[PDB]
Amino acid sequence: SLRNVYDMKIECPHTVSENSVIGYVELPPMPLADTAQMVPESSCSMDNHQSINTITKYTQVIWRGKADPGQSSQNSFETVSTEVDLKGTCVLKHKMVEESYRSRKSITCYDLSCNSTFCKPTLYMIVPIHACNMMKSCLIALGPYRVQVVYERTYCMTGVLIEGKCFVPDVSIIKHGIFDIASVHVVCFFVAVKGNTYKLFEQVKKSFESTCNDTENKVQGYYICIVGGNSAPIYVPTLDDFRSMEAFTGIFKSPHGEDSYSIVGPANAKVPHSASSDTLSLIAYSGIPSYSSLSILTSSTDAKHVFSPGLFPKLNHTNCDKSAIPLTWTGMIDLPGYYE
Amino acid sequence: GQSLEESGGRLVTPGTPLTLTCTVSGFSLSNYNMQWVRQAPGKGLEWIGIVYTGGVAWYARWAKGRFTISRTSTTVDLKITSPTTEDTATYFCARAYTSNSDIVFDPWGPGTLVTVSSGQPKAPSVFPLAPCCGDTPSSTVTLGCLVKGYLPEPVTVTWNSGTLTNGVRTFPSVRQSSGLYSLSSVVSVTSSSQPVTCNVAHPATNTKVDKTVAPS
Amino acid sequence: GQVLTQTPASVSAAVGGTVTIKCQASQSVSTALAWYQQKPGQRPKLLIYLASTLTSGVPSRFKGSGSGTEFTLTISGVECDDAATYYCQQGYSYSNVDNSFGGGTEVVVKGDPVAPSVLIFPPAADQVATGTVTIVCVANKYFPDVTVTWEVDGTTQTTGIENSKTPQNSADCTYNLSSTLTLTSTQYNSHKEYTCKVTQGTTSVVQSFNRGDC
Ligand SMILES: *[C@@H]1O[C@H](CO)[C@@H](O)[C@H](O)[C@H]1NC(C)=O
Ligand SMILES: *[C@@H]1O[C@H](CO)[C@@H](O)[C@H](O)[C@H]1NC(C)=O
């Protein structure tokens, strides 16, 4: 109630070499109305990308019903789609991470896990590996919360701290003679970019039995991921990169992430608000905030970002009709390499 | 029994760097966030900045570049990089009311007084205040002391080395047309209980003066 | 950046009555508002943290309320000890903030009306030596406020007057005031009668002295 500051630990190896590190902290629930115009304000604003604090157009989908005072089910309900402006959300632009490495700029953004009335913000910070030599403690302000960035130098030459051991993610012929496999944590963000090489759902159609025709008119872009808190960015999907296809499988087989609430009912919404017909299927629920409320509409080459507090967007692709893809995804993938 | 006590308030010429220190008693400084707040005489509370347990300082928009807050194991600092005459105020030190928090702040220190002016420090001259002898005497009389032309604040006035307190009215100071301050203190006593002595101490000049006043 | 606005700037309430003061925020601060009480020459004292939670030792006569953007503070059965200046402070966000505190509100507690006693002190013989003299006039234990006028030889004075008023007595709400007239020794020795008049409404209590008499 009075406790408002949280620590965000970011681990650093002793030796530093396109590598970016990531830290995150899940903040306590805050009222949904107070998340409007909420933007991260960091002390170290002298070296952060200026585009994250800019406005990204979202289609907001909420549900609201009427029920008896002691009832969990609803006598009636409806959904409302509105165009809202959200700043500071984890909308990464094309080559923003690469430009930030050569520019020594941080990426500070947040994810939103909301029900109909409250939101759990998850604050992320992506810094180049060059931020692990100075290891200067930074301060980020997000709404009513204060976050202290704490850099800890793990005991490993370049690798990842995994269960008290140091694992270096890798290969090829050398791997056959000897190798080891480690389960490594990964965070992914969808980068919306039009392009003949970024037609993502052409590979969704090939990897999965998903009956998905007319991939030309579906969202274009890729996911960018940082593994072990220290690696070069992995572009997802990449057909000849088995690590990339492992992340690709986890994103679309476990779209809500790898980690009570009672379903009130399915609903459809117009995305964007100006759409002539319903374009997105969702499931209205009651329950404490759980999974991310941020997603991107599937059936639009230009990314239509959706914010659906209290609704679970259609993430299945057995029918690409009125579906969505997650904005963020966290999970574990198995990587070859060695311990040091 | 947690408390705070600021230090370092003094008279400085404009542009002279000044550092204020906030010693802490009764609790561990490592567990709380600290803030500095200043108050010009007669004016409202002005927030300056907050220093968090991680050592990073967060300042107000107007204060950015004019102040520096820093933290040690047992002290909290505040440095005015180049003071101006507008910086004259009492500077307060405040602990966050709870750990892991910066929403509200308690307890507070008494504050320390910073004076920024080109004038030299000046000891006060003390003059007796007594009724004109022409009028008829009464069984109860009021006597006083005028403390005029001192810089900077504060000045402490007591009567009979603090052993007499009833009927003592020490009015708050007034800044004169010049930069000098002035105030007066009075006390009412019976004509039998004589005499009374006012003690005036001006720590800025290491000045202590006693004045015994009699009705004449 | 949130800006806290307090109204009114000053309020006057009768002893034992109820007084309400308001705090308004430019942007929402939810429940992270606090109320501080400060008396003259004293450090701020926290009374209410969050919207309505009293700290230890604060009487139940203080209560606070509000949420989001509008907050009020009410004192029921206000005592003379409650006479102070009250500040609201928000801890929701310190980003792009010029002041976490509002402008403040001073509450004057109306006690029993008491007429002032007036004393006038001629300059000491030591004063006249220095080239400037200061005549001190004191008004004691009065309420409501008073206006003081200086006239020398009947000529009302408009320059060199310094007024200092004590904070309200914590028991009976009364004031105390000192007024000083400073003149050069040449001007002081150039006139006979120096009178101090303290006006409270329509009644003026005036005290005088002659320079020759002292
Ligand atoms: C929404 O989440 C908050 C946070 O825990 C919870 O207190 C509230 O009951 C939830 N709302 C519903 C309708 O379940
Ligand atoms: C859709 O759900 C089915 C099972 O309900 C699952 O087998 C399939 O993989 C899902 N679609 C995608 C694209 O993963």
Numbering used by the authors:
A (entry chain A): 18 to 34, 37 to 189, 193 to 281, 291 to 371
B (entry chain H): 0 to 215
C (entry chain L): 0 to 213
Quoted passage from the original study:
To elucidate the epitopes targeted by mAb HTN-Gn1 and mAb nnHTN-Gn2, we crystallized and determined the structure of HTNV Gn in complex with its cognate Fab fragments to 3.5-Å and 2.7-Å resolutions, respectively. Two nearly identical copies of the HTNV Gn−Fab HTN-Gn1 complex (1.2 Å RMSD over 317 aligned C-α atoms) and one copy of the HTNV Gn−Fab nnHTN-Gn2 complex were observed in the asymmetric unit of each respective crystal. Structural overlay analysis reveals that the two Fabs bind to distinct faces of HTNV Gn, where Fab nnHTN-Gn2 recognizes an epitope comprised of β-sheets β1, β8, and β9 of the Gn and Fab HTN-Gn1 targets residues in the loop that links HTNV Gn strands β4 and β5 (loopβ4-β5, residues 82 to 96). The epitope of the non-neutralizing Fab nnHTN-Gn2 is slightly smaller, occluding approximately 930 Å2 of solvent-accessible surface area, and reinforced by 17 hydrogen bonds. Furthermore, consistent with its non-neutralizing functionality, this fitting reveals that the mAb nnHTN-Gn2 epitope is not natively accessible on the mature virus surface. As expected, none of the mapped NE sites overlap with the epitope of our non-neutralizing mAb nnHTN-Gn2. In contrast to the accessible mAb HTN-Gn1 epitope, non-neutralizing mAb nnHTN-Gn2 binds to a region of the Gn predicted to be sequestered within the higher-order (Gn-Gc)4 spike lattice.
